[PDB]
Amino acid sequence: MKIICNQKILANRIGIAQKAINGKTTIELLKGILISTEEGQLKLTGYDAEIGIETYVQAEIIEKGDVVVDARLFGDIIRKLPDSFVEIETDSENNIYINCVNSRFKIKGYAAKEFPKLPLNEEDLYSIPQEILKNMIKQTVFAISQDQTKPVLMGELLEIVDRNLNLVAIDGYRLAVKSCSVDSLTENIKVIIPGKTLIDVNSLLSGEDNVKVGFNEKNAIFIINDTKIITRLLEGDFIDYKKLLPREHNSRVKLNTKELLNSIERASLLSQNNLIKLSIRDKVMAITSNTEKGNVYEEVEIDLDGDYLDIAFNSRYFIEGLKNIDNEEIFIEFTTNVNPCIIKPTDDVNYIYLLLPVRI
Amino acid sequence: MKIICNQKILANRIGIAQKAINGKTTIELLKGILISTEEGQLKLTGYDAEIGIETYVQAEIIEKGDVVVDARLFGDIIRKLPDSFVEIETDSENNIYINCVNSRFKIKGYAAKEFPKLPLNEEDLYSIPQEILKNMIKQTVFAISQDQTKPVLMGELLEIVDRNLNLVAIDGYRLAVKSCSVDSLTENIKVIIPGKTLIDVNSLLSGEDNVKVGFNEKNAIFIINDTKIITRLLEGDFIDYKKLLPREHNSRVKLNTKELLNSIERASLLSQNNLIKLSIRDKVMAITSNTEKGNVYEEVEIDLDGDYLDIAFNSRYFIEGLKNIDNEEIFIEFTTNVNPCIIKPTDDVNYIYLLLPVRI
């Protein structure tokens, strides 16, 4: 193998392939990135049982071939080289020579022979705006279970129903749902993707252009410019989340998102399970906590329709919600002090954050 | 106690007092900051056996008094309050009430009675430019011992001899010395200050104005605007470091500081005890490493006077040195492959970084 590429591009694409490398893998080779020549183009593959990534690096191909390199060492070298041309060559022992301005490295390489093939379509690929998918993941993924006895709830439900795309995260205490109507999504689909993997996907989305998405029985595939991400789907049944959305509310407040966040943050300084209390009255909502460490009384201006209410919540769950809402104002809907609240941005019909109270 | 001050100022000064709080202290009270009223001014004290800090917060004093508050809780509250007026009050149980816009906290306080008094002078105080002391600490402190069997070498030697101030760090492998002639320093002094503490001091120096410095048998004192830092001195004899400076050199190179740093950094990617080799020839210095992980050959342009040389060094010690030299170019002086090198910036007669080679 013998190729020449730009340093900045190679470093950038190594970072992308690295996302699929599992440092705790049991298969030695899978700590490596597969480099392989194609046509005016190098391909980099990172592979794990849960996630495969292929990415392209424009290159002059002097001599075709492939080799596997330790993904961490490869990245550490390329990252420190100056912004110039990088020459990469292999010998018949699979040594890798990397040359760039006044640097010459020779490191160990490994035969490509046993490197997994990546599982597909392009006709069965659908176009979604990056910004949308980005925001969908961002506004939900923090809400997945961390309970490893519930692997399914460590996934998010991605569902297309009648040209609506929905991404759903639930953990037994809160539920986050973000929707968009996308026209290209003419087929109904329901799958569960590990949230960990959706975080990786989100990191590769820029916010311009589209990501092309496809699904089979075993995998979801995301195409972002020249990058292909393949994510193993979770098998099983998702919680029937639609049944948890209240049909009615007895109270509805409107308030400034950041104002509430700041107040909960302050109130939570004392309660650090993390309890805070909301006292909904006309014109003001009080946020309080009382520990033996002290008490906090915070006030936030509200507009109220409906009943006065006192209700307790986990501050972390509340904070994690409000942190991820850039909207200036939110509505929050309530019924009784044992039922969830529902947060809805005033200027976004497409997002729900539902949260169970603490019965105390 | 009852006072009103600005939030941003109080937060800033809490950060300063916090530097003296030892979270692993065995004395419960010393996790607290002493708040105490003076005159148009609150004082905040943080205290540890090794270091005491007093700092001033402009304030309206409605009612005089003092109280001790948990330093971490106090900081966490003040930091999250809006940029407005903060009212702080105590009751006879030493509860602390903190009020600010729409926030009301009540937290535990503690009686000032048993809070240590801080050990002094002002006539015996000397003026040094902040920038100078800052650079002195920055360019040496990284070189102290980390060997806790050698507490003295975990200190730096501060010495005034004939209006020259010197700060010296040594660990048995390298020696860093930074000097300045300061005229106000009319008296000869030799003391050892823990480097950990000098790091704290450096963090409080801005780079404008002077820091006023004073010494007795037990303490050094630093006055930075309205902040007083008292640092317990280390007892014992410092290494006689002047005897380690070679009287002669057989080789002298001139080179670009960052160029060398980048090359050592690259070379060290393979050797990660951390060995690299320097091959001094005319016009070029080669930097190499060879492990079973691979080899690196780096080239750096030099001007050489004197002998050709091959010599091995610990890359970390070399890197730590070069990282802390902003000067565009350095000289490095050498004798044999078993003797130290000496790094001297081309445009700074006042700094030495000396480093022993590895005998291999």
| CA–CA separation, A248 and A306 (whole Å) | 12
Residue A48 tokens, joined: 């794990």
Name B335's Cβ contacts closer than 8 Å, sequence gap at least 6.
Answer: B246, B248, B249, B250, B251
Please check whether residue A338 is in contact with residue A359, taking contact to mean a CB–CB distance below 8 angstroms. Answer: yes
Name A246's Cβ contacts closer than 8 Å, sequence gap at least 6.
Answer: A333, A335, A339, A340, A342
Residue B113 tokens, joined: 């009675």
Domain boundary among the residues A233, A257, A281 is at A233
Nearest CA in chain A to B301: A102
| CA–CA separation, B104 and A269 (whole Å) | 12
Please check whether residue B48 is in contact with residue B31, taking contact to mean a CB–CB distance below 8 angstroms. Answer: no
Please check whether residue A10 is in contact with residue A84, taking contact to mean a CB–CB distance below 8 angstroms. Answer: no
C-beta neighbour count of A14 within 10 angstroms: 24
Residue A109 tokens, joined: 């390489």
Claim to verify: residue A102 and residue A9 sit in the same structural domain: yes
CB contact under 8 A, B266 and A299: no
Residue B173 tokens, joined: 């492998």
Claim to verify: residue A160 and residue A226 sit in the same structural domain: no
| CA–CA separation, B110 and B68 (whole Å) | 5
Chain A CB contacts of B102 below 8 Å:
263, 298-300
Q: Which stretches of B245-341 are DSSP H helices?
A: 257-271, 315-323
Q: Would you list which residues of chain B are within 8 Å, Cβ to Cβ, of chain A?
A: 73, 76-77, 80-82, 102-108, 262-263, 265-266, 269-270, 293-300
Claim to verify: residue A294 and residue A324 sit in the same structural domain: yes
Name A338's Cβ contacts closer than 8 Å, sequence gap at least 6.
Answer: A357, A359
Q: Give the helix/strand (H/E) hosting B5.
A: strand B2-6
Q: Which stretches of chain B are DSSP H helices?
A: 7-17, 71-80, 130-138, 195-204, 257-271, 315-323
Name A139's Cβ contacts closer than 8 Å, sequence gap at least 6.
Answer: A176, A178, A324, A325, A351
Q: Give the helix/strand (H/E) hosting A190.
A: strand A189-194
Name A318's Cβ contacts closer than 8 Å, sequence gap at least 6.
Answer: A264, A276, A355
Chain B CB contacts of A286 below 8 Å:
none
Q: Give the helix/strand (H/E) hosting B19.
A: none
| Side chain identity, residue B92 | S
Rounded alpha-carbon distances, angstroms, from residue B66 to B3, B41, B46, B92, B115: 11, 12, 14, 11, 10
Residue B311 tokens, joined: 């010599």
Q: Would you list which residues of chain A are within 8 Å, Cβ to Cβ, of chain B?
A: 73, 76-77, 80-82, 102-108, 262-263, 265-266, 269-270, 293-300
Does residue B251 sit in helix, strand or coil?
strand
Claim to verify: residue B97 and residue B240 sit in the same structural domain: no
Backbone angles phi, psi at A242, to 5 degrees: -55, -30
Name A32's Cβ contacts closer than 8 Å, sequence gap at least 6.
Answer: A68, A69, A70, A71, A110, A115
Please check whether residue B338 is in contact with residue B250, taking contact to mean a CB–CB distance below 8 angstroms. Answer: no
Interface test with A, best of B266, B268, B284 (most A CBs within 10 A): B266
| CA–CA separation, B200 and B254 (whole Å) | 34
Claim to verify: residue A146 and residue A169 sit in the same structural domain: yes
Backbone angles phi, psi at B152, to 5 degrees: -65, -35
| CA–CA separation, B66 and B45 (whole Å) | 11
Instruction: Give residue numbers after which chain A breaks (C–N above 2.5 Å).
Output: 119, 272
Per the entry, the structure determination technique was X-ray
DSSP lists the bridge partners of residue A129 as: A210
CB contact under 8 A, B266 and A106: no
Claim to verify: residue A178 and residue A199 sit in the same structural domain: no
- What is the nearest CA distance from A105 to chain B, expressed in angstroms? 4
Q: What angle do CA A43, A45, A47 make, to 5 degrees?
A: 170
Residue B101 tokens, joined: 């816009």
Q: Are strands A219-224 and B32-37 parallel, antiparallel or unpaired?
A: unpaired
Claim to verify: residue A295 and residue A202 sit in the same structural domain: no
Claim to verify: residue B201 and residue B290 sit in the same structural domain: no
**Residue reference for tokens 């040359």:** A99
Please check whether residue A73 is in contact with residue A84, taking contact to mean a CB–CB distance below 8 angstroms. Answer: no
Q: Give the helix/strand (H/E) hosting A342.
A: strand A341-345
Smallest Cβ distance to B107: which of A76, A294, A298?
A: A294
Please check whether residue B91 is in contact with residue B74, taking contact to mean a CB–CB distance below 8 angstroms. Answer: no
| CA–CA separation, A135 and A194 (whole Å) | 17
Claim to verify: residue B138 and residue B108 sit in the same structural domain: no
Domain count, chain A: 2
Question: Of A201, A235, A233, A238, which Cα lies nearest the Cα of A219?
Answer: A233
Question: Of A317, A312, A342, which Cα lies nearest the Cα of A330?
Answer: A342
Domain boundary among the residues B210, B233, B256 is at B233
| CA–CA separation, B140 and B227 (whole Å) | 24
Please check whether residue A257 is in contact with residue A318, taking contact to mean a CB–CB distance below 8 angstroms. Answer: no
Claim to verify: residue A5 and residue A138 sit in the same structural domain: no
Backbone angles phi, psi at B216, to 5 degrees: -130, -155
CB contact under 8 A, A103 and B296: yes
Chain B CB contacts of A77 below 8 Å:
266, 269
Query: Cα A30 to chain center, whole Å?
Result: 23
Does residue A168 sit in helix, strand or coil?
strand
Please check whether residue A325 is in contact with residue A343, taking contact to mean a CB–CB distance below 8 angstroms. Answer: yes
Claim to verify: residue B124 and residue B137 sit in the same structural domain: no
CB contact under 8 A, A297 and B103: yes
Smallest Cβ distance to A297: which of B81, B104, B107?
A: B104
Residue A298 tokens, joined: 């915070």
Please check whether residue A46 is in contact with residue A71, taking contact to mean a CB–CB distance below 8 angstroms. Answer: yes
Q: Which domain holds residue A98?
A: 1-129+195-233
Q: Are strands A284-291 and B66-70 parallel, antiparallel or unpaired?
A: unpaired
| CA–CA separation, A102 and A82 (whole Å) | 9
Please check whether residue A188 is in contact with residue A162, taking contact to mean a CB–CB distance below 8 angstroms. Answer: yes
Residue A176 tokens, joined: 């986050």
Please check whether residue B278 is in contact with residue B264, taking contact to mean a CB–CB distance below 8 angstroms. Answer: no
Does residue B48 sit in helix, strand or coil?
coil
Rounded alpha-carbon distances, angstroms, from residue A339 to A183, A249, A254, A260: 36, 10, 19, 20
Please check whether residue A10 is in contact with residue A80, taking contact to mean a CB–CB distance below 8 angstroms. Answer: no
Claim to verify: residue A134 and residue A74 sit in the same structural domain: no
| CA–CA separation, B233 and B238 (whole Å) | 12
| CA–CA separation, B42 and B54 (whole Å) | 10
Q: Is the alpha carbon torsion for A142, A144, A145, A149 positive or negative?
A: negative
Domain boundary among the residues B218, B233, B248 is at B233
Backbone angles phi, psi at A4, to 5 degrees: -135, 130
Interface test with B, best of A102, A104, A285 (most B CBs within 10 A): A102
The data reach a resolution, in angstroms, of: 2.1
| Side chain identity, residue B103 | S
| CA–CA separation, B268 and B271 (whole Å) | 5
| CA–CA separation, B165 and B182 (whole Å) | 7
Q: What is the DSSP string of A84-132?
A: SEEEEEE-TT--EEEEETTEEEEE--B-STTPPPP---SSS-EEEEHHH
C-beta neighbour count of A308 within 10 angstroms: 11
| CA–CA separation, A47 and A333 (whole Å) | 45
Smallest Cβ distance to B296: which of A105, A296, A297?
A: A105
